[PDB]
Design an enzyme around this catalytic site. Structure first.
Site, PDB file in Angstrom:
ATOM      1  N   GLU A 180      -5.257  -6.110  -5.982  1.00 57.45           N
ATOM      2  CA  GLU A 180      -4.586  -7.213  -6.658  1.00 57.45           C
ATOM      3  C   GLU A 180      -3.062  -7.168  -6.548  1.00 57.45           C
ATOM      4  O   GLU A 180      -2.392  -8.170  -6.790  1.00 57.45           O
ATOM      5  CB  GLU A 180      -5.072  -7.359  -8.091  1.00 57.45           C
ATOM      6  CG  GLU A 180      -6.541  -7.740  -8.125  1.00 57.45           C
ATOM      7  CD  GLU A 180      -7.101  -6.710  -9.064  1.00 57.45           C
ATOM      8  OE1 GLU A 180      -6.347  -5.769  -9.451  1.00 57.45           O
ATOM      9  OE2 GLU A 180      -8.290  -6.888  -9.405  1.00 57.45           O
TER      10      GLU A 180
ATOM     11  N   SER B 120       0.831  -1.196   0.000  1.00 62.13           N
ATOM     12  CA  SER B 120       0.000   0.000   0.000  1.00 62.13           C
ATOM     13  C   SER B 120       0.864   1.245   0.000  1.00 62.13           C
ATOM     14  O   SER B 120       0.353   2.338  -0.055  1.00 62.13           O
ATOM     15  CB  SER B 120      -1.024  -0.001   1.136  1.00 62.13           C
ATOM     16  OG  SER B 120      -2.150  -0.831   0.814  1.00 62.13           O
TER      17      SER B 120
HETATM   18  C1  LIG Z   1      -2.094  -1.971   1.581  1.00 60.71           C
HETATM   19  O1  LIG Z   1      -1.043  -2.430   1.966  1.00 60.71           O
HETATM   20  C2  LIG Z   1      -3.383  -2.489   2.265  1.00 60.71           C
HETATM   21  N1  LIG Z   1      -3.307  -3.887   2.665  1.00 60.71           N
HETATM   22  C3  LIG Z   1      -4.140  -4.835   2.234  1.00 60.71           C
HETATM   23  O2  LIG Z   1      -5.065  -4.542   1.472  1.00 60.71           O
HETATM   24  C4  LIG Z   1      -4.133  -6.320   2.572  1.00 60.71           C
HETATM   25  N2  LIG Z   1      -3.719  -7.026   3.627  1.00 60.71           N
HETATM   26  O3  LIG Z   1      -3.415  -6.320   4.806  1.00 60.71           O
HETATM   27  C5  LIG Z   1      -3.209  -7.284   5.871  1.00 60.71           C
HETATM   28  C6  LIG Z   1      -2.023  -7.218   6.772  1.00 60.71           C
HETATM   29  C7  LIG Z   1      -4.568  -7.207   1.500  1.00 60.71           C
HETATM   30  N3  LIG Z   1      -4.275  -6.973   0.211  1.00 60.71           N
HETATM   31  S1  LIG Z   1      -5.005  -8.068  -0.755  1.00 60.71           S
HETATM   32  C8  LIG Z   1      -5.483  -9.034   0.627  1.00 60.71           C
HETATM   33  N4  LIG Z   1      -6.026 -10.253   0.636  1.00 60.71           N
HETATM   34  P1  LIG Z   1      -6.081 -11.360  -0.619  1.00 60.71           P
HETATM   35  O4  LIG Z   1      -7.490 -11.932  -0.772  1.00 60.71           O
HETATM   36  O5  LIG Z   1      -5.679 -10.762  -2.003  1.00 60.71           O
HETATM   37  O6  LIG Z   1      -5.204 -12.489  -0.081  1.00 60.71           O
HETATM   38  N5  LIG Z   1      -5.240  -8.372   1.776  1.00 60.71           N
HETATM   39  C9  LIG Z   1      -3.697  -1.592   3.446  1.00 60.71           C
HETATM   40  N6  LIG Z   1      -2.465  -1.135   4.114  1.00 60.71           N
HETATM   41  C10 LIG Z   1      -2.050  -1.504   5.332  1.00 60.71           C
HETATM   42  C11 LIG Z   1      -0.817  -0.754   5.831  1.00 60.71           C
HETATM   43  O7  LIG Z   1       0.058  -1.422   6.492  1.00 60.71           O
HETATM   44  O8  LIG Z   1      -0.811   0.477   5.539  1.00 60.71           O
HETATM   45  C12 LIG Z   1      -2.692  -2.506   6.102  1.00 60.71           C
HETATM   46  S2  LIG Z   1      -2.166  -2.908   7.740  1.00 60.71           S
HETATM   47  C13 LIG Z   1      -2.959  -1.759   8.794  1.00 60.71           C
HETATM   48  N7  LIG Z   1      -2.739  -1.593  10.102  1.00 60.71           N
HETATM   49  C14 LIG Z   1      -3.631  -0.615  10.650  1.00 60.71           C
HETATM   50  C15 LIG Z   1      -3.512  -0.169  12.090  1.00 60.71           C
HETATM   51  C16 LIG Z   1      -2.541  -0.831  12.857  1.00 60.71           C
HETATM   52  C17 LIG Z   1      -2.314  -0.499  14.167  1.00 60.71           C
HETATM   53  N8  LIG Z   1      -3.022   0.488  14.750  1.00 60.71           N
HETATM   54  C18 LIG Z   1      -2.747   0.833  16.176  1.00 60.71           C
HETATM   55  C19 LIG Z   1      -3.971   1.159  14.031  1.00 60.71           C
HETATM   56  C20 LIG Z   1      -4.229   0.855  12.713  1.00 60.71           C
HETATM   57  C21 LIG Z   1      -4.512  -0.083   9.746  1.00 60.71           C
HETATM   58  S3  LIG Z   1      -4.225  -0.741   8.142  1.00 60.71           S
HETATM   59  C22 LIG Z   1      -3.828  -3.358   5.660  1.00 60.71           C
HETATM   60  S4  LIG Z   1      -4.872  -2.461   4.514  1.00 60.71           S
END
Ligand code: A1L2O
Ligand code: A1L2O
Ligand code: CL
Ligand code: CL
Ligand code: CL
Ligand code: CL
Ligand code: CL
Ligand code: CL
Ligand code: CL
Ligand code: CL
Ligand code: CL
Ligand code: CL
Ligand code: CL
Ligand code: CL
Ligand code: CL
Ligand code: CL
Ligand code: CL
Ligand code: CL
Ligand code: NA
EC number: 3.5.2.6
Lengths: 267, 267
Positions: free
Chosen positions: B145, B46
């Site tokens: 994707e 992301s």
């Molecule tokens: C971009 O990296 C986004 N990530 C995702 O969409 C996916 N997984 O995230 C899981 C760890 C994803 N992509 S495709 C898929 N499944 P598929 O069916 O294709 O197998 N899953 C967004 N970005 C982020 C990021 O790190 O920026 C995240 S993780 C996050 N952590 C928080 C958070 C954490 C801690 N605190 C205290 C607050 C908030 C928010 S997002 C996932 S979405």
């Protein structure tokens, strides 16, 4: 008592040519200094380009720009006094060549281009100087407009002392790292415009880097230099001049003479 | 001798978690850099949304878009992980709020919507980066994707160094004008997803702006940040990680630790 004498000769020189001379000079080996009107404002004219080139090298070092990146400006109409930028206009220039052009020939197009694309205009150029602790300097106008040199006007001015302090920071201090400073120094050593100013005040076998300015009104001109004498530490010399009438010519000999007096005084 | 040490600690950390760590870091105050695997490709996840935000603000500056124009998407099915766009779905959002949301909460619908209406798709987003002289980065897929993170696959990747370079250009350089840059910086400073990564690696009273990515396969996650220490110039830190097996979880502590090592090394 003999630093009052040097002040006396500067007085007489200013009285002789009916204008105003500002001097600051530092012997970095001993710390002796000499000032005359060293805290009064003078028009910078083209003399800020020497700092502008320093700013470019600083962004190179900060990895924001590449010294060999090509700079293209086929579409641009070039300012008056653009000797280098005119001859490269078909093919672009490296950033480093444009920067040394701004310094070593006082090329106006080179200055304006660099200020518009890389430094944030006159405001960014001012901010650059604040960042090395220079509180006097102000750039307000672009290259062709800042040379009006109107008596009493504080736009586009600094003080002799502040120019000296900044040159000493950039050419001999720690703003630029060893490699990037060496390029800066070489840029100053190859300036082409200063043979009748500070350079003329010193023995031929000394090494001089400098930057001149010539406003072309009010007989306003200036020069700052780093000077390497044989077997001694660097001197810094900074001379600013203005005259009373719009139509007065500047005086290279008055500058060279003030420089000569300033070198004796810090000795 | 002490920059080889930093590389050694990164080695042990990658061996410790059985994966691959890429680091690049710049100190803008001195120009010191530190790299480990800084020229290897890693999945962006992301983390590209931080650049996408920059792209939107650039078209604002070009007056191609208005930061307060309403963006309506009642009709649309939202991507997974669209927390902000879900909450505004009835009434639409300003362009600026959609863009900040993409950055601060990693909002997928916001990302996709912006790319489809305003930036010309993954192709357009890649071309944006070519336009600031980033030759590594490539985006090939849309938001959900591109997170597959398959070992050896070069689609939707960049290099630590290139991300670092671009962040430095966008967050500190002159792609954005002073006003628009400040907005970008504020957007970065208020990211909500990064508390356990680069942010965790620095003293509480430093100001940090960042963007994370988490592919959620192959333990692939990353974070890049602009860092403002008290009384020093900005740092840039960029950390990318991958793991061996599909089912491996990412490690926020490995990132924070790599960050900590990288900061010491550029110092
Ligand atoms: C971009 O990296 C986004 N990530 C995702 O969409 C996916 N997984 O995230 C899981 C760890 C994803 N992509 S495709 C898929 N499944 P598929 O069916 O294709 O197998 N899953 C967004 N970005 C982020 C990021 O790190 O920026 C995240 S993780 C996050 N952590 C928080 C958070 C954490 C801690 N605190 C205290 C607050 C908030 C928010 S997002 C996932 S979405
Ligand atoms: C900056 O000081 C100076 N710029 C100028 O462009 C003007 N100088 O006028 C000449 C004195 C100028 N700008 S605005 C204007 N007229 P207006 O009323 O229409 O607004 N005139 C540049 N720097 C310098 C400098 O001294 O660095 C000069 S003087 C110079 N001499 C040489 C030279 C001399 C001698 N040799 C052997 C070789 C080269 C090159 S530049 C003018 S341009
Ligand atoms: Cl006499
Ligand atoms: Cl004195
Ligand atoms: Cl004085
Ligand atoms: Cl000028
Ligand atoms: Cl370079
Ligand atoms: Cl002109
Ligand atoms: Cl003032
Ligand atoms: Cl000489
Ligand atoms: Cl004229
Ligand atoms: Cl161990
Ligand atoms: Cl490396
Ligand atoms: Cl690969
Ligand atoms: Cl490739
Ligand atoms: Cl915020
Ligand atoms: Cl990880
Ligand atoms: Cl963890
Ligand atoms: Na006399």
């Amino acid at each position: 008592n003999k630093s009052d004498a040097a002040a006396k000769q500067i007085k007489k020189l200013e009285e002789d040519f009916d204008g105003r001379i500002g001097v600051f000079a530092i012997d970095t080996g001993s710390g002796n200094t000499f000032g005359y009107r060293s805290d009064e404002r003078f028009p910078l004219c083209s003399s800020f380009k020497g700092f502008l080139a320093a700013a470019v090298l600083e962004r190179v070092q900060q990895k924001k720009l590449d010294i060999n990146q090509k700079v293209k400006y086929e579409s641009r109409d070039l300012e008056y006094h653009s000797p280098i930028t005119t001859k490269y206009k078909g093919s672009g220039m490296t950033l480093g060549d444009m920067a040394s052009a701004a310094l070593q020939y006082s090329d106006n197009g080179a200055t304006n281009i660099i200020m518009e694309r890389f430094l944030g205009g006159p405001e960014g150029m001012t901010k650059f100087m604040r960042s090395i602790g220079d509180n006097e300097f102000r750039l307000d106008r672009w290259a062709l407009e800042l040379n009006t040199a109107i008596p009493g006007d504080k736009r586009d001015t600094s003080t002799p002392k502040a120019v000296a302090n900044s040159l000493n920071k950039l050419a001999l201090g720690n703003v630029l790292n060893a490699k990037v400073k060496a390029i800066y120094q070489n840029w100053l050593k190859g300036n082409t415009t200063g043979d009748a100013r500070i350079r003329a005040s010193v023995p031929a076998d000394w090494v001089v880097g400098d930057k001149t300015g010539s406003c072309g009104a009010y007989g306003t001109a200036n020069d700052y230099a780093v000077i390497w004498p044989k077997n001694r530490a660097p001197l810094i010399v900074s001379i600013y001049t203005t005259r009373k009438s719009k139509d007065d010519k500047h005086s290279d000999k008055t500058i060279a003479e003030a420089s000569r007096i300033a070198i004796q005084a810090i000795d």
